[PDB]
Amino acid sequence: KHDSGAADLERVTDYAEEKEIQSSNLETAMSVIGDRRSREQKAKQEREKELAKVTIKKEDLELIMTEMEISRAAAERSLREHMGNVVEALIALTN
Amino acid sequence: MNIRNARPEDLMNMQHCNLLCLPENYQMKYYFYHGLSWPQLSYIAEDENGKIVGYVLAKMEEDPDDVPHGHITSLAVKRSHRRLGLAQKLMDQASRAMIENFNAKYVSLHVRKSNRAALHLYSNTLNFQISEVEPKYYADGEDAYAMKRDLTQMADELRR
Amino acid sequence: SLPPKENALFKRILRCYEHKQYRNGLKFCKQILSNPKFAEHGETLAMKGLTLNCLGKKEEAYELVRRGLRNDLKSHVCWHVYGLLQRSDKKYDEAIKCYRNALKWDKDNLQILRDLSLLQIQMRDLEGYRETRYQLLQLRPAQRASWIGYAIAYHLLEDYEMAAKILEEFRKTQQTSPDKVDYEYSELLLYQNQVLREAGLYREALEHLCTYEKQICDKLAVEETKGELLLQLCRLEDAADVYRGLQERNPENWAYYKGLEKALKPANMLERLKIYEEAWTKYPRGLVPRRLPLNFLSGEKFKECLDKFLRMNFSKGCPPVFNTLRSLYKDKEKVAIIEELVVGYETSLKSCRLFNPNDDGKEEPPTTLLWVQYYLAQHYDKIGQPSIALEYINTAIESTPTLIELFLVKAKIYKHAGNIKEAARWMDEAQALDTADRFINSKCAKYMLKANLIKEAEEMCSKFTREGTSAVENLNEMQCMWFQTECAQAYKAMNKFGEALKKCHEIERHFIEITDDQFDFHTYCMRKITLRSYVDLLKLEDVLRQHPFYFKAARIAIEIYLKLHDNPLPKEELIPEKLAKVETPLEEAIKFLTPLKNLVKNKIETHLFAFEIYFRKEKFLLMLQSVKRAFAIDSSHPWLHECMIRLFNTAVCESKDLSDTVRTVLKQEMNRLFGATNPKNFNETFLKRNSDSLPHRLSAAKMVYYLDPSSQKRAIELATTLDESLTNRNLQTCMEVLEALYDGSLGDCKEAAEIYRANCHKLFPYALAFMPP
Numbered sequence A: 001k002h003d004s005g006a007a008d009l010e011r012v013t014d015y016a017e018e019k020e021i022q023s024s025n026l027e028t029a030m031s032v033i034g035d036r037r038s039r040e041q042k043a044k045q046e047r048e049k050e051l052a053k054v055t056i057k058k059e060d061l062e063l064i065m066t067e068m069e070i071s072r073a074a075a076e077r078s079l080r081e082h083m084g085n086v087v088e089a090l091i092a093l094t095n
Numbered sequence B: 001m002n003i004r005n006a007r008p009e010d011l012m013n014m015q016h017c018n019l020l021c022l023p024e025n026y027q028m029k030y031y032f033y034h035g036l037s038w039p040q041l042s043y044i045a046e047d048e049n050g051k052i053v054g055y056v057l058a059k060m061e062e063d064p065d066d067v068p069h070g071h072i073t074s075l076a077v078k079r080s081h082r083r084l085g086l087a088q089k090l091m092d093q094a095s096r097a098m099i100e101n102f103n104a105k106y107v108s109l110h111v112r113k114s115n116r117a118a119l120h121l122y123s124n125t126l127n128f129q130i131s132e133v134e135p136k137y138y139a140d141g142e143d144a145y146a147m148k149r150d151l152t153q154m155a156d157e158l159r160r
Numbered sequence C: 001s002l003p004p005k006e007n008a009l010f011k012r013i014l015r016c017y018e019h020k021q022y023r024n025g026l027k028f029c030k031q032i033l034s035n036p037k038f039a040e041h042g043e044t045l046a047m048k049g050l051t052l053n054c055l056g057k058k059e060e061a062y063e064l065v066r067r068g069l070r071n072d073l074k075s076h077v078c079w080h081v082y083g084l085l086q087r088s089d090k091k092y093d094e095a096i097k098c099y100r101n102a103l104k105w106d107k108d109n110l111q112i113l114r115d116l117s118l119l120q121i122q123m124r125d126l127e128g129y130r131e132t133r134y135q136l137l138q139l140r141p142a143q144r145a146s147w148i149g150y151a152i153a154y155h156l157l158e159d160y161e162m163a164a165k166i167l168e169e170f171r172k173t174q175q176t177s178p179d180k181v182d183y184e185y186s187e188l189l190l191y192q193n194q195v196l197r198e199a200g201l202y203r204e205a206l207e208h209l210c211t212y213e214k215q216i217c218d219k220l221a222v223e224e225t226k227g228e229l230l231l232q233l234c235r236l237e238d239a240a241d242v243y244r245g246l247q248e249r250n251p252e253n254w255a256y257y258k259g260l261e262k263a264l265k266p267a268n269m270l271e272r273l274k275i276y277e278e279a280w281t282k283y284p285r286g287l288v289p290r291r292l293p294l295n296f297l298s299g300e301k302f303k304e305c306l307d308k309f310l311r312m313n314f315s316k317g318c319p320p321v322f323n324t325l326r327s328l329y330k331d332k333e334k335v336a337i338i339e340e341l342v343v344g345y346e347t348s349l350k351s352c353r354l355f356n357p358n359d360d361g362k363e364e365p366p367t368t369l370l371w372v373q374y375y376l377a378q379h380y381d382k383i384g385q386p387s388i389a390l391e392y393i394n395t396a397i398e399s400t401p402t403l404i405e406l407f408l409v410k411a412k413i414y415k416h417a418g419n420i421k422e423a424a425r426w427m428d429e430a431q432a433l434d435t436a437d438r439f440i441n442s443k444c445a446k447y448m449l450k451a452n453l454i455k456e457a458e459e460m461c462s463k464f465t466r467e468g469t470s471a472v473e474n475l476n477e478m479q480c481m482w483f484q485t486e487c488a489q490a491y492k493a494m495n496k497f498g499e500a501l502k503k504c505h506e507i508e509r510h511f512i513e514i515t516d517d518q519f520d521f522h523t524y525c526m527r528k529i530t531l532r533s534y535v536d537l538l539k540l541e542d543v544l545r546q547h548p549f550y551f552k553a554a555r556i557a558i559e560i561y562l563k564l565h566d567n568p569l570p571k572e573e574l575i576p577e578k579l580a581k582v583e584t585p586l587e588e589a590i591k592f593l594t595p596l597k598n599l600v601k602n603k604i605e606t607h608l609f610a611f612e613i614y615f616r617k618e619k620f621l622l623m624l625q626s627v628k629r630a631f632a633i634d635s636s637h638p639w640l641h642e643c644m645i646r647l648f649n650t651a652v653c654e655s656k657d658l659s660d661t662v663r664t665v666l667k668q669e670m671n672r673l674f675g676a677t678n679p680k681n682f683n684e685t686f687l688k689r690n691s692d693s694l695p696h697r698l699s700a701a702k703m704v705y706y707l708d709p710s711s712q713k714r715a716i717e718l719a720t721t722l723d724e725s726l727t728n729r730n731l732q733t734c735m736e737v738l739e740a741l742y743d744g745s746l747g748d749c750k751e752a753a754e755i756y757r758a759n760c761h762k763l764f765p766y767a768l769a770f771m772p773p
């Protein structure tokens, strides 16, 4: 009667109820999240704002993605991080 | 040998020890089911080099009809490491963890009747008493003794 | 929509699906389709397809769902079940698209976001999983998981300080509730404490710990953490108190002795041995305090303490004694102490029948002398003298011929010597004694696998496998990776790259399973609150593939794939012959290499494999990339040097047709590490720096021929030195030299290989690789 755990591993996916919680002073805290969520969205918005305003010579892309065997998104990331210098980027990728 | 609680990082080496020593083998998702449901329960005996040499895969059996109790899903020690009491030291650490966390009352296991030496260790060293005979329990068609160990003494020994 | 009599049956299909009443779920599907007015309904054809995907019928499932989606593609349910369906076949890129399309028609559908977050945490999209969980926190701030998945999101992102606040306002709810489950609440606080300590708030964690420690059922966590925080804040009096109670709980654990040392701060070995000596006396049965001091004790203090340890185990007859000593043998100073002590035991037990003629105790049984000779066969086997090591274990066998542990050492001796075949013949006898111990079985089979005995070993493993199928198949079912790994290496050595590639791929399938297995535990653990361990699994899943099993697989595969590229000849069943004849070997070897590059960068063999791949692809900036990484670990590695020569030589010998951007990157970075040399001097310089290490000589004598093939006589003269003063003039390096002569890496040395073969046979007389023809 050795089950081998087959029957047990079915208790994991079994149906269950979503437990709830006593309502106590939550809108106080729930407003604090939108403060940290917004300053997350703000800080993340300005990071890509600096990255977008960078020169992107295309022939540099096709070279990095082929010499480093990385993808276009990764190759675009390295180039913008290095302000559009292929060497200064192709070197860091080697590291 | 170092004795310590088993973390998820250990389970793949536990399965390696299992498939080396026991014919009762399990899937990894089952090893996860133990370490992620009753993490305090399973323990390992490890080398200086992190090589698991003995293990205990423990579990809290879910019976609402009676008192809470534990179950050893698997226990094994390499033959290269006998006469070290790893079986005893491991069963003790797991048993206590059954009390601290889930207020466990006893603990159960099944064993081949042809394995008297292991049975004798449970019977004399660890006070495991036979509760029933479940025949042809293993795939080999061999009858297994359904042992039990009263944890009331150990729990009172700690209430102090 | 649907009629309230035919619609309320659709509400049944979902419950039957939510509760896995599948065959019932089909029943209410037939009740709606058999009505011709709705015989082709979008949502009904959709959910019936899914209810069939939870059964074997997947090919029909994609039809009925796609047909149902074609009927109504503006329905969130119809898109939802397509992603759910596609998720089961691990098309995450597509399933996550359907999840988004689904959300366009149902503005804030909860369950769609859960299946999204569940797939987002599986894909490790930690900032998207953040927002997807945040919506759930905005929508239902009363559901328990809504706060957990959010707090988990910040902890995975390493915003530790924020996640602590999140667990707090959730925890405030639990103390007020009278339905609180004590184990779940205990797990919650220990995760909250673990968050703080990961953020460096050690003081705050201790105050948090004490208050809720009464509420924490787990007492190993409470105390192991306390002893850790009390050391950080300098509280050595309280930390020493905690670790004494941890040693009482589990003496055998090592950290509690180290924690006691950190708390007590012993002045020197005398005051430091007292920590363990007190543990000798309080718990004498324990072996850990008897062994641990042998790591730092030296001279007289070490010899006195060692004498107690062996006498306790040569009498008690402990088989695993040499195992603890095994780690101590790095110190040759301590070896002579052991060698002299035990040969002292040997004599005094043979003539006077006791440990020491001077010690006044009852004479020892004849077992102790055997339990000694057990050690002295494992001793002289580690000091590379199997000649004398055999004369001990043999003389030990005539006394007792039924002791299995004597045979395991008889095989180990030949294993460390060159003969594997003779050793496997001894493991065969060991398992014959106890035929119910799968341990000796598995090791015999392993020893048989290593002797190119696949059929022999399968029959051995066949005893403990299921009797309804082949043993090999049962080992794949039960993820028996020591079997796949040793039998794949066994196949490869027999030039059966097809079968060997099979197993390497079967191993990766196991890692795919263990990586997929976590999915059902995202809702499970958030329900059971085992939050500490849930993370520790998530962090294990991320670096799962660094386990030594996958490296043993990818090694063989990449090695095999390179060997095929150079000299070429129910998911997909992996067919051997098809795998070997692959069009793109290098591109498949990279599939094995990429996990090595991301998860095991501290092992130099990773990058040196990346070279051998990217070298044959002429991706020069990748040859540079990996040599750089291998250089940062060992600048003098012999294999790395072979790579650097070819990198330097091919650049100069083929630089004209290279991009004016490569040469720029290729030369300034090269000059920083290579300097301005030529390949021959940089090789000669490497030989002068490393002339006393044979692995380094062979890797230079290989490169003097790669650079100047006319120096074959110098090359063979370099890599043949048998001066014992050399470092690593061992068995393996010598086999590599003879291999290299036969390999032609040093050119054709038919006349010369014989001399190295018969001379190495003089030093490893039991070595098969040096046996005359």
Ligand SMILES: O=P(O)(O)O[C@H]1[C@H](OP(=O)(O)O)[C@@H](OP(=O)(O)O)[C@H](OP(=O)(O)O)[C@@H](OP(=O)(O)O)[C@H]1OP(=O)(O)O
Pocket: B051, B080, C412, C415, C443, C482
């Ligand atoms: O597991 P590995 O890292 O690959 O190492 C193995 C092996 O380990 P496993 O049995 O756990 O698979 C052996 O056995 P154990 O002591 O763990 O039971 C031990 O090999 P033996 O079978 O010869 O005892 C051996 O020995 P050593 O201590 O000399 O390194 C060592 O061997 P190799 O890695 O050299 O094959």
